Amino acid sequence: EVQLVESGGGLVQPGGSLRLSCAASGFNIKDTYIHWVRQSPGKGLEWVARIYPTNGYTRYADSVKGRFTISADTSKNTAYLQMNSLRAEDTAIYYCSRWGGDGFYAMDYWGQGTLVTVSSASTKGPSVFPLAPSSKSTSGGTAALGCLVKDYFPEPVTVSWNSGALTSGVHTFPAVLQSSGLYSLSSVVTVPSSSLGTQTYICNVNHKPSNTKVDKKVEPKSC
Amino acid sequence: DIQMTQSPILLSASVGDRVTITCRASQDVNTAVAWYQQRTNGSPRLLIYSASFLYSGVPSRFSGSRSGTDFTLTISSLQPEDEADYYCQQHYTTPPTFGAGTKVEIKRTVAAPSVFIFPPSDEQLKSGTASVVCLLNNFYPREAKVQWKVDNALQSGNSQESVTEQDSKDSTYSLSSTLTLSKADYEKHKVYACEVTHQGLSSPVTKSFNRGEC
Amino acid sequence: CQFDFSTXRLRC
Amino acid sequence: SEVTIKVNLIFADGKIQTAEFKGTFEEATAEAYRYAALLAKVNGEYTADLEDGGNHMNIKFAG
Amino acid sequence: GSYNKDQQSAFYEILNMPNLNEAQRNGFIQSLKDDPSQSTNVLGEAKKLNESQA
Ligand SMILES: OC[C@@H](O)[C@@H](O)CO
């Protein structure tokens, strides 16, 4: 199986430097072009740079020339993007992709992508609060409950339920940027009313930028 | 540089419909045009390359064509899992460039939301802030009005909404509206109410609680 | 329509 | 300025799709008509009924 | 790896820039190592950052 895995993305101050890696497996990067492509609210999908590891030839987008460099280590089957003099406009998901693989003249595999956030704001871990099921969150024999993941920076956070064993009926809402400059989101799940009190429900919250990992048991309130 | 212009920006159609989206290059790109799909939480995925050729594993209901500098992507029989954004990309000249995308949504029957409300947690109340959450589950279409009232006074400027993308199983939406107050303000008022207006309801639905009640 | 990191989707 | 033209696409078999075009009024207009003409190749001659001063269109295809 | 006298020169200029912090200085040096074809562009962007941080 062909795979590309980006790593290295994170919060960086304007003017700062970051280095991304793109680890390839299932093919040899000597046989293809490797590209970096980014995706942002402001510019959508935007090509950044490419390299042909066989001969080392590179090309760059005008907007990153001089500030970014692309390179590759064929012995580690890995490509890199050095990112200097960073600006707000560089905030984006960075993907690596291959081109010309197996004779296909398109980008036929893309990695999951890694988020780069260019900001002077500080890292902050979320508080995780229960959304307890109650007489006000049930109807038709089913009940809603959840977790409120509040006041974190930067993105991303991940939320799962019962260590990923619970997926049916889950809605994890898009993160919202609050006026404070911090993010917040809720994740809810709908379950049988009759399961409350017998089945344990835990939301697993991870905010890697702050090394925050919370497992929150959510249950009906006391009275 | 070459620009790629995609139309329409949004297209909504029923399961089984034939849908066509378009991409225009600002100058000759030969056939060097690819189409990508991006599903919710996903990376771009290759569908069509060299204007008209289907990538391996892509369903045969997808097809592409070229006429001069005009390119089309067609889905012959729209499936629920085709709900996604679609992007075209030319690789004829450097820099390779992408279109702005076309969002494709699924039409389905009207469904009223299930409406629920959650007081601030006691845990949160230990700090100085209260979040009150109103939840609208599994409704269609997306349009919905959610208004907050506190002791019957209409609230404004102190809530935020978030809406999921269409569900993979039933093509519905869900929405959260979060009302944020100081602890002090929350403890000063009694009745917290979310009022929901939606096409599937015969009249607006109010869900409420009194602070302090179990 | 505008791309959102959180969903990896255009929002219109 | 930036406007959104909302379009109903009404096909001869009664099926209905909806679409949006954004840009200046003049650009969005042109793109809507261009898209209509393209669909007309497969779905038959189109007719376009403008309402809301041009900002909403009903486009019916003859089949 | 080894370098020619031009490459060595670009290194020397960045090494000496008084208004870069050490993260920036080494990021740019890394770029010179990454892609020799970009030496002039990289030097130019280092100069601009150095000047703006005077
Ligand atoms: O990519 C993970 C994203 O869904 C969360 O960070 C919420 O935005």
Helix (H, G, I), strand (E, B) or coil at D54: helix
* Torsion, CA A150, CA A155, CA A161, CA A165, rounded to 10: 180
Q: How far apart are CA A109 and CA A86, in angstroms?
A: 27
CB atoms within 10 A of CB A64: 24
Q: How far apart are CA A31 and CA A101, in angstroms?
A: 7
Residues 6+ apart with CB under 8 A from D30: none
Question: Which amino acid type is present at position B140?
Answer: Y
Q: Which domains does chain E have, with CATH numbers?
A: 1-54 (1.20.5.420)
Tokens read off for E51: 């000047």
Strand A18-25 versus strand A3-7 pairing type? antiparallel
Residues 6+ apart with CB under 8 A from B14: B78, B106, B107, B108, D15, D17
Contact call for A41 and C6, based on CB within 8 A: no
Cβ–ligand 1 contact at A155 (below 6 Å): yes
Determined by X-ray
| Mutational test site, ligand 1, from A157, A177, A187, A212, max ligand atoms within 8 Å of CB | A157
Strand B145-150 versus strand B114-118 pairing type? unpaired
Q: In angstroms, what CA-CA distances link A49 with A71, B22, E40?
A: 10, 27, 17
Burial class (CB in 10 A: 0-12, 13-18, 19+), A60: buried
Q: How far apart are CA A41 and CA C2, in angstroms?
A: 6
Q: How far apart are CA A66 and CA A166, in angstroms?
A: 48
Q: How far apart are CA A90 and CA A38, in angstroms?
A: 9
Looking up tokens 């898209």 gives: D35
CB atoms within 10 A of CB E32: 22
What is the domain range of residue D58?
A: 1-63
Chain B with chain C: Cβ pairs closer than 8 A: 26
Q: How far apart are CA A96 and CA A36, in angstroms?
A: 4
Cβ–ligand 1 contact at A157 (below 6 Å): yes
Nearest to C3 among A40, A156, A175 (CB): A40
Q: Which domains does chain B have, with CATH numbers?
A: 1-108 (2.60.40.10), 109-211 (2.60.40.10)
Q: Could you tell me where in chain A the CATH 2.60.40.10 domains are found? A: 121-220
Instruction: Specify the residue with its C-alpha closest to ligand 1, atom 4.
Output: C6
Is cis: bond before B120, omega within 30 of 0? no
| Mutational test site, ligand 1, from A155, A173, A208, max ligand atoms within 8 Å of CB | A155
Burial class (CB in 10 A: 0-12, 13-18, 19+), B214: exposed
DSSP string, chain A: --EEEEE---EE-TT--EEEEEEEESS-GGGSEEEEEEEETTTEEEEEEEEETTTTEEEE-TTTBTTEEEEEEGGGTEEEEEE-S--GGG-EEEEEEEESGGG--SEEEE---EEEEE-SSPPBPPEEEEE---TTSEETTEEEEEEEEEEEBSS--EEEEGGGTB-TTEEEPPPEE-TTS-EEEEEEEEEEGGGBTTB--EEEEEEGGGTEEEEEE------
Distance A173 CA to ligand 1 centre (A): 9
The alpha helices in chain D, defined as continuous H runs, are 25-43
Closest CA to B114 of A137, A184, A216, A126: A137
Structurally, how many domains does chain D consist of?
1
Contact call for B165 and C9, based on CB within 8 A: yes
Which pairs count as long-range contacts for A24-28, CB under 8 Å and 24+ apart, including other chains? A24/A77, A24/A78, A24/A79, A24/A98, A25/A1, A25/A77, A26/A1, A26/A2, A27/A2, A27/A98, A27/A101, A28/A74, A28/A77
Dihedral angle sign, alpha carbons of residues D42, D47, D52, D55: positive
CATH number of the domain where residue D63 is located: 3.10.20.10
Closest atom of ligand 1 to A185 CA is 7
Q: In what helix (H) or strand (E) does residue D44 lie, and over which residues does it extend?
A: none
Closest CA to B15 of D15, A64, A29, A210: D15
Q: Assign a CATH topology to domain A121-220.
A: Immunoglobulin-like (2.60.40)
